[PDB]
């Protein structure tokens, strides 16, 4: 009665593992990396029914970003100065002039014998340094000399985190989950097809997620496994928290020719008082925000248990502090002033976070490399949107006494999956068969 009939152009698909294009300043690395334009993207096609299954914890788009962002970064800064010759014994004293007390011992004033453009002459030069980049001998040396020759990031390369969009290649499509409050896994009932994702800013940070998207309705707490203390908990806020960060001290920059076309940028004398870098977080806003987080958090905890927030104890700066880059400088701020509370499970104007900065930055774990950010002249003023948090559980024996929770670090994948959870890529499979009542 029926014979095989072949149908081509059948609207079906399978899970894909593919490479997305990227789509979009002169100096900005992402601006020059992907020129593929995007903006006129009312290309979203609602799919009735479907109910596609998503799993953000296995999302290979996150993995792609990790690989490509690191590559772009390294490629962009590979052809710069390579300040191997800066790794010499330094003669240092502390900067002790127009300073505050919180800066005592923070800055060093070091002199050294630097090469000149001629391979027979040396010059006496000096630079100010942050103590976090300089290690005492038994005289001082730069800390990186233990593992790596370092470079100098090019002053003409911009890492402003302009948003980029990802687009699927022909034969592939991206399924977007529109299920409001989708936790991150399972049968998303409302999906649409796009060729290109919305723009995501490639912002690098620990503890606090900055300038990402906000939840459409209510604060969302999600994790791969909420009962596993080995897993991170990602929290998306439905409102931003305003954070104002600054680097006081009007700095200047020297330019030293160390070789035939090789310039090194030293930190020169500071104009005005020397003060500590810091961030200002609205007190009330933060309070309200965590109140919402705990009210949601309680979904997975015992009745009237007591929940606390605590100091980010751990072994390093990328573990215990809030790292970020703004104004071109790398900040390591102390967030213990934020994560300090008890919610009682029955309760009824600016937190200042002291902050330090560094120039010799490894970026992504690693043993060697490191980019020596050059000095920035003048002062830095940054205002950001805290859009989310990364936290962990203690996982101890339970005798009431719920986790005191700590913010923490991790690799960059967790700062992207927080946005990428909405997308899945599938392969289109247009060829298939069905029985039909026909013959040639």
């Amino acid at each position, epitope marked *: 009665n029926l014979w095989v009939t072949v149908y081509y152009g059948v609207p079906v698909w399978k899970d894909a593992e593919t490479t997305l294009f990227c789509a979009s300043k002169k100096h900005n690395v992402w601006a020059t990396h992907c020129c593929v334009p995007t903006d006129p993207n009312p290309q979203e096609i609602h799919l009735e029914n479907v109910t596609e299954e998503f799993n953000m914890w296995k999302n290979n788009m996150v993995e792609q970003m990790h690989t490509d962002i690191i590559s772009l970064w390294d490629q962009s800064l590979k052809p710069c100065v390579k300040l191997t010759p800066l790794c010499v014994t330094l003669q240092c004293t502390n900067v002790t002039n127009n300073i505050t007390d919180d800066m005592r011992g923070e800055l060093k004033n070091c002199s050294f014998n630097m090469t000149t453009e001629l391979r027979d002459k040396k010059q006496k030069v000096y630079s100010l340094f942050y103590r976090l980049d300089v290690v005492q001998i038994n005289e001082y040396r730069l800390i990186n000399c233990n593992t790596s020759a370092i470079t100098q990031a090019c002053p003409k390369v911009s890492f402003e985190p302009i948003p980029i969009h990802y687009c699927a290649p022909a034969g592939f499509a991206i399924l977007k989950c529109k299920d*409001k409050k989708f936790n991150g896994t399972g049968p998303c009932p409302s999906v649409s097809t796009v060729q290109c994702t919305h723009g995501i800013k490639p912002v690098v940070s620990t503890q606090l997620l900055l300038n990402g998207s*906000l*939840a*459409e*309705e*209510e*604060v969302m707490i999600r994790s791969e496994n909420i009962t596993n203390n080995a897993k991170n908990i990602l929290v998306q*806020f*439905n*409102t931003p928290v305003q954070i104002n960060c600054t680097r006081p001290n009007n700095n200047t920059r020297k330019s030293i020719r160390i070789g035939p076309g090789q310039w090194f940028y030293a930190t020169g004398d500071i104009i005005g008082d020397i003060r500590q870098a810091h961030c200002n977080v609205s007190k009330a806003t933060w309070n*309200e925000t965590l109140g*919402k987080v705990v*009210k*949601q958090l*309680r*979904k997975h905890f*015992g*009745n*009237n248990t007591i929940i606390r927030f605590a100091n980010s104890s751990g072994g390093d700066l990328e573990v215990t502090t809030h790292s970020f880059n703004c104004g071109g400088e790398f900040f390591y701020c102390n967030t213990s002033g934020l994560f300090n509370s008890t919610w009682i*499970s*029955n*309760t*009824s104007d600016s937190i200042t976070l002291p902050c330090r900065i560094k120039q010799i930055i490894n970026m992504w774990q690693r043993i060697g490399q490191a980019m020596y950010a050059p000095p920035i002249q003048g002062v830095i003023r940054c205002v950001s949107n805290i859009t989310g948090l990364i936290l962990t559980r203690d996982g101890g024996s339970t005798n009431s006494t719920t986790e005191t929770f700590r913010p923490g670090g991790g690799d960059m994948r967790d700062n992207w999956r927080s946005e990428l959870y909405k997308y899945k890529v599938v392969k289109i499979e247009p060829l298939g068969v069905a029985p039909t009542r026909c013959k040639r």
Partner: antibody, heavy 118, light 107 residues
Framework: QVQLQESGPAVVQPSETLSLTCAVS?????????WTWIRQAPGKALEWIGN????????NYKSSLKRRLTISTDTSKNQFSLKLTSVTAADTAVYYC??????????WGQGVLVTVSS | DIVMTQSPSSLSASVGDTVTITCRAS??????LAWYQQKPGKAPKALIY???NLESGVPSRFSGSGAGTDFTLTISSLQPEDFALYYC?????????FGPGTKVDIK
């Protein structure tokens, strides 16, 4: 802290539009909260109507009312409101506004008893 | 829709008694249940959220537990101010749904 307060017509005639406004004080209309309309018909259990978010719209309506019901806000007066067209006798209820947060309604107003009658 | 019901429809009690009422879902709603206290003339006061967590301003005599479809509200040492109607609601999905309520009367 937060105080909600409803106002509007106590009597609406059949076929007309009912419009109730819930003023918000003690907090902002623009916050990340679900502004919600709920009504309790006389002699009946409480029934959910719908909601709107202070920072995003992104409303939720009882589907049976979606062709008659509009929920919106006005940030200049720090208020939200319920607009229901083509009212009938079955819509007699005391309407309350409430503030939804995560798992419950933290704040409630006083309510407006609305009768649908010529 | 997820339909909520309650049992008993009414309960008689004295002051100091421990009383309980049961809320039942037509669908498994894991722990997305909230309980309220309604007094004549007023909007209800939230009591308990996520099946068992006490809301602020609620006396410690209020407790409860449950999962899936079967949930219980417990009031120990019932006080004269507690002779109220109690409601449960699910917020697992839309429409948000309230049960019929249980009226607690004083003997």
């Amino acid at each position: 802290q937060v105080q909600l307060q409803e106002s509007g017509p106590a009597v609406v005639q059949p076929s007309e539009t009912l419009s109730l406004t819930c003023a918000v004080s003690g907090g902002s209309i623009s916050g990340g909260y679900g502004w919600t309309w709920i009504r309790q018909a006389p002699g009946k259990a409480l029934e959910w109507i719908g909601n709107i978010y202070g920072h995003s719209g992104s409303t939720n309506y009882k589907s049976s009312l979606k062709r008659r019901l509009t929920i919106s806000t006005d940030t200049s007066k720090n208020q939200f409101s319920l607009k229901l067209t083509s009212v009938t006798a079955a819509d007699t209820a005391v309407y309350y506004c409430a503030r939804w947060s995560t798992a419950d309604f933290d704040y409630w107003g006083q309510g407006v008893l609305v009768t649908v009658s010529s | 829709d997820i339909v909520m019901t309650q049992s008993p429809s009414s309960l008689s009690a004295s002051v100091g008694d421990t009383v309980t009422i049961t809320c039942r879902a037509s669908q498994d709603i894991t722990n997305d249940l909230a309980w309220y206290q309604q007094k004549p003339g007023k909007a209800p006061k939230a009591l308990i959220y996520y099946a068992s967590n006490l809301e602020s301003g609620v006396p410690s005599r209020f407790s409860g537990s449950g999962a899936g479809t079967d949930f219980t509200l417990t009031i120990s040492s019932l006080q004269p101010e507690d002779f109220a109607l109690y409601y449960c609601q699910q917020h697992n999905n839309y429409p948000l749904t309230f049960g019929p309520g249980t009226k607690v009367d004083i003997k």
